[PDB]
Curated annotation (Swiss-Prot), chain B:
Name this protein carries in UniProt: Syntaxin-1A
Quaternary structure note: Part of the SNARE core complex containing SNAP25, VAMP2 and STX1A; this complex constitutes the basic catalytic machinery of the complex neurotransmitter release apparatus. The SNARE complex interacts with CPLX1. Interacts with STXBP1. The interaction with STXBP1 promotes assembly of the SNARE complex. Interacts (via C-terminus) with KCNB1 (via C-terminus); the interaction increases in a calcium-dependent manner and induces a pore-independent enhancement of exocytosis in neuroendocrine cells, chromaffin cells, pancreatic beta cells and from the soma of dorsal root ganglia (DRG) neurons.
Post-translational modification: Phosphorylated by CK2.
Top-level division of the source organism's lineage: Eukaryota
Range within the parent protein: 197 to 258 of 288
Record location of the Glycyl lysine isopeptide (Lys-Gly) (interchain with G-Cter in SUMO) cross-link: 56-57, 60
Swiss-Prot record, chain D:
Stretches for region Interaction with CENPF: 1-55
Domain t-SNARE coiled-coil homology: 1-61
Subcellular location(s) per record: Cytoplasm, Perinuclear region; Cell membrane; Synapse, Synaptosome; Photoreceptor inner segment
Post-translational modification note: Palmitoylated. (Microbial infection) Targeted and hydrolyzed by C.botulinum neurotoxin type A (BoNT/A, botA) which hydrolyzes the 197-Gln-|-Arg-198 bond and inhibits neurotransmitter release.
Superkingdom of the source species: Eukaryota
Coiled coil: none
Quaternary structure, from the entry: Part of the SNARE core complex containing SNAP25, VAMP2 and STX1A;this complex constitutes the basic catalytic machinery of the complex neurotransmitter release apparatus. Recruited to the SNARE complex following binding of the SNARE complex component STX1A to STXBP1. This complex binds CPLX1. Found in a complex containing SYT1, SV2B and syntaxin-1. Found in a ternary complex with STX1A and VAMP8. Interacts with HSC70 and with SYT9, forming a complex with DNAJC5. The interaction with SYT9 is inhibited in presence of calcium. Isoform 1 and isoform 2 interact with BLOC1S6. Interacts with CENPF.
Role description: t-SNARE involved in the molecular regulation of neurotransmitter release. May play an important role in the synaptic function of specific neuronal systems. Associates with proteins involved in vesicle docking and membrane fusion. Regulates plasma membrane recycling through its interaction with CENPF. Modulates the gating characteristics of the delayed rectifier voltage-dependent potassium channel KCNB1 in pancreatic beta cells.
Lipid attachment in record (S-palmitoyl cysteine): 65
Identification of the protein by name: Synaptosomal-associated protein 25
Name of encoding gene: Snap25
Sequence similarity: Belongs to the SNAP-25 family.
From Swiss-Prot, chains E, G:
Organism of this sequence: Rattus norvegicus
Membrane-topology annotation of the record: Peripheral membrane protein
Molecular function as annotated in GO: protein-containing complex binding; SNARE binding; soluble NSF attachment protein activity; syntaxin binding
Gene that specifies this protein: Napa
Modified residues (Phosphoserine): 27, 30, 196
Quaternary data: Interacts with PRKCABP, and disrupts the interaction between GRIA2 and PRKCABP, leading to the internalization of GRIA2. Found in a complex with VAMP8. Component of a SNARE-like complex that contains at least ZW10, USE1L, RINT1, STX18 and NAPA/SNAP-alpha. Interacts with VTI1A. Interacts with STX12. Interacts with GNA12 (via N-terminus); the interaction promotes CDH5 localization to plasma membrane.
Protein name listed in UniProt: Alpha-soluble NSF attachment protein
Main location: membrane
Length: 287, 62, 63, 66, 289, 287, 289
């Protein structure tokens, strides 16, 4: 605690003697040209000083030390160690100031893509997208990052992760009122899930959301769409969701707010609703 | 006799609910751990691959 | 009593539907873990084979 | 009323007992994989450390020789 | 996109550079006799170009480059890396040309089983069968591949995987092939699960399936098998499926299509169909006379 | 079929080549002292020959070749590869003739425990116990094996593994008219199961089982044990098991045989019993 | 035991050989040079002896041998072998005498955090906490260890383990420590869980515990806490815990022991009460006046 802060100052002195090491590189390395291991141990002292900084809860200092060690270490050699240092710096920067974490993570992404490790690159893509969602307000950059990560994942037949990424992207797009992409993604994921006996209980919600998205744009074609879904999946009518949608669309033929309001309240009486669904219904049913 | 049935139904349903919550928690924890171990294993694989490559090149230098 | 039975029926409905809804996602998570296990197994097998062949070749060369 | 009620109680009892037993069984099995997984993490990290230290020491020794 | 065009240009440049590298390596082996590092670095260039190219969204030429690199690598007495590259090429060709992927995967399977590994060979067999059935309309090759995978799994006491493979094989055979093999496999798998830890109450379904096959063959055989199962598995007496089957038996005995129709309608109403039982019931009803 | 015949033909060919290899290798070592590379080559030939024997569906000869390779390798002052060959031979011998499989697995366990690793030795012990139980009737050896594996597991803090072995040993001991060990194991595991956040719900079952076997003595002892358990676990009376035990005790005190039979049948109907419970209840009814 | 007798005999033989090997070590440190390899072989035989002693059920002897080998190994500029041997000695001392196990585990923790592996350090800290609380009659050191483990886990992004650790430590502290920390930790964990879909359906229990902690101090503040909770979490109003709390506080307002007792008994009728909750209810009852 208070005692480990004095040794953090001593770790700043360790950074000072690492400054002396780079001074060796400046002047003395002419006679110590074979001391590349000296540079390696300079990087090691950098790394453990940064570890002491991390234990000292100086996130900015820890990230600075991580970045400096990565920059010194990436002498066109031991690239994976540099990538590990960069990702450590990004994790340290996740708290406090995360802006430069994005740049260090993009550099790690480039390094891994050059190496060809798609899985870790896609995981970092998801990480940057989600930190964008939770810290910043931009969604388009997160959308692009998620699309790229989904492409990378689907490249290696990792269908579940790509499907969930596309589900989140479609939900956000529906929030961003781009319904063609939403319905496309929802239909694709639902039909793919219906292929396997494992996920045959999950489609109902997917098809319900797709029907909502379709019915938002064109109400006349909503009947045809739901009929096509029912004939595709004969057990889609028995579900309460299909009944509720049919009731709502048949009631909309007559301008009676009471019928649909009572229907939605009755449905809400068995189970609570989500913000997305409630907002979508409030927006659409206004007219 | 049906009142005993409804009482036992409530009890068993409540028990199954609590069970399911516990299983969900444990499954989440296991998944988290699987993620971390997969990451570490891939890193070790890459490290050993480059290690063998560099060692073979060093031997060839001899 | 009959109204007590009806409210208990509502409770049963809510509990059963909630349990089923959670079951769906629990099964999805189990599927994801089963998917990851095969990849980790394959990577581990590859590393084992590579290290074995490399170390044996180095030992033979040392002779 | 009597026949349908007897059918309902019998089916409810059997189904509830089956679900309860299966749930308890899954509960008991999960812990075995949990503990094994702790063990495999231990072994993996030990392997990582050992191989890292071995290779770095060997590179240093090779540099000393050369 | 700029990325796609630039990547394609640099990939073609790398391919030409690698071809010139291999030709000047053939020249240098006699000219200088440098050993084998020239071919190894040419293979490294080939692998880098192929992986960049597959990242470039274009697949076929990436798989061709992988095949060429693997062949050149195997030319130098190196097999495991060649097998992995063959597997990668097959995966890439999965979406480009099924035949080349199948050939590469067969080569990988044979080399892997020559090495001694069987689980990976069984997985590759299952993948081959899945790709063959999903797009190409053929079963017998799929049945043989599934049987080989089950054999390989049982060779290493992998009971669950072999059980699943044999279940799928029996289902396919009953759907298309004769019923004797389906009867044996279904009965064996059903009776090999009496003392399952969690699956104590699941084997019943299997038994039911077997009976239907018997009921497809002859009435006397169907009733005899029902009685033998009744005696063998007492719990099967209390199964709803048992009552349904007995009702269907007694209805079909007296040749009253209405009774069978209403029984099957009620059965579907109580529980939803599976798209497999309905077909067999239709085939049974087709011979009511 | 044809593939098996060809594999076996080339396997006999390679076996002839391998006997030639060993003979000429000893001859060349005597006459030239070429080292031990030829012995390693012969070992690899033996290993691949055994592999193709397994491919040929001849497990006895494959296991014989594996054992020969293992003994030759341990003669070469190396153990781990010899241990792998021994365990491979044991797996091959599992089917067909499993007798010598027991001896080879014993040798593997001996070498493993000599090295100092416990979990693999426990796995081999439990596998040997399973072999004895499934193919033989000498349950004493199975009890010994299960107890030894359980002891190893508890010593290595693997309580979960030890619990299953203890339960199996207790069940088998109760089967052979021996109740002290069953009572002790069941009560110990139930007591240690009191605080488990997950297992607590099932903690009742073991207790009940103990009571049943403890009734094999006489009316009274059983009452004291069940009431002690009820105090120790206050909720134990919630389940129908305590009601059933009280019904059994009261019916047997007055010699109400028909009521006892009807209650057992009713319990069977609401929830069926297994072979062990039925046999124990019938044995209790005899007196 | 004859096997145990021979095992102890060869254990004594190995101990005598280890004594001869420490003689070799002191001779090669003062008489000869290059004894590092000789004392490494001494460490190997020490480890063999300790392992076989552990096999012999002599846990104290095995732990003592492990500790001696570890302290001898520390001098060879080697730290990870020292850490492994210290962990082995701590595991051996876990049973029988665990007091020195705490010291050895703390040394191992210090060395580990010196290297930088935090997760394993957190697991060892939690093991120290659990052994101390189960075997040593003292809780404050357990509180400190749980706080350290939570800090380590939350500093490494491992959220779930930190959450469980914080919940456990807060619940334990609520028993014998001021409830302010319990209130803060319960509120924090509930807020963290609400957004997540994992424990959103279980956060009602945490809110109930926080409300009970609020009530145990005062009522008006408890009413403010419950109204704030139901304002921020609208679905809690339908929770049976909400009605139970409202009934309890309504009864407490009028100072009727009878109604409060009957209400808590009715609540116990369904489900079952817990030791901690029963103690809290009794404690709040005892100050009704």
């Amino acid at each position: 605690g208070m005692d480990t802060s004095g040794k953090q100052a001593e770790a700043m002195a360790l950074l000072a003697e690492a400054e002396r090491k780079v001074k060796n590189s400046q002047s003395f390395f002419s006679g110590l040209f074979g001391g590349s291991s000296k540079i390696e141990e300079a990087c090691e002292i950098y790394a453990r000083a940064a570890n002491m900084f991390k234990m000292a809860k100086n996130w900015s200092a820890a990230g600075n030390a991580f970045c400096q060690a990565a920059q010194l270490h990436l002498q066109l050699q031991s690239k994976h160690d540099a990538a590990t240092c960069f990702v450590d710096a990004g994790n340290a920067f996740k708290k406090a100031d995360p802006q430069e974490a994005i740049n260090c993570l993009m550099r790690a992404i480039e390094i891994y893509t050059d190496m060809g490790r798609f899985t870790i690159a896609a995981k970092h893509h998801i990480s940057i997208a989600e930190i964008y969602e939770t810290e910043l307000v931009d969604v388009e950059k997160a959308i692009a990052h998620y699309e790229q990560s989904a492409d990378y994942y689907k490249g290696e037949e990792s269908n579940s992760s790509a499907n969930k990424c596309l589900l989140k992207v479609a939900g956000y797009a529906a929030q961003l009122e781009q319904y063609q992409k939403a319905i496309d993604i929802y239909e694709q994921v639902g039909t793919s899930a219906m292929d396997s006996p494992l996920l045959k209980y999950s489609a109902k919600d997917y098809f319900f959301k797709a029907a909502l998205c379709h019915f938002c744009i064109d109400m006349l074609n909503a009947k045809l769409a739901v009929q096509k879904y029912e004939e595709l999946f004969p057990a889609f009518s028995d579900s309460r969701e299909c009944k509720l949608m049919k009731k709502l669309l048949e009631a909309h033929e007559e301008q009676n707010v009471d019928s649909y309001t009572e229907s939605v309240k009755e449905y809400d009486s068995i189970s609570r609703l989500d913000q997305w669904l409630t907002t979508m219904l409030l927006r659409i049913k206004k007219t | 006799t049906r009142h005993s049935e409804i009482i036992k139904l409530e009890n068993s349903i409540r028990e199954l609910h609590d069970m399911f919550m516990d299983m969900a928690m444990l499954v989440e924890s296991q998944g988290e751990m699987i993620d971390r171990i997969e990451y570490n294993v891939e890193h070790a694989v890459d490290y050993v691959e480059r290690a063998v490559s560099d060692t073979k090149k060093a031997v060839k230098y001899q | 009593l009959a109204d007590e039975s009806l409210e208990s029926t509502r409770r049963m409905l809510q509990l059963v539907e909630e349990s089923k809804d959670a079951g769906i996602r629990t099964l999805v998570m189990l599927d994801e873990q089963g998917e990851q296990l095969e990849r980790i197994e394959e990577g581990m097998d590859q590393i084992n084979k590579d290290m074995k062949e490399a170390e044996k070749n180095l030992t033979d060369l040392g002779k």
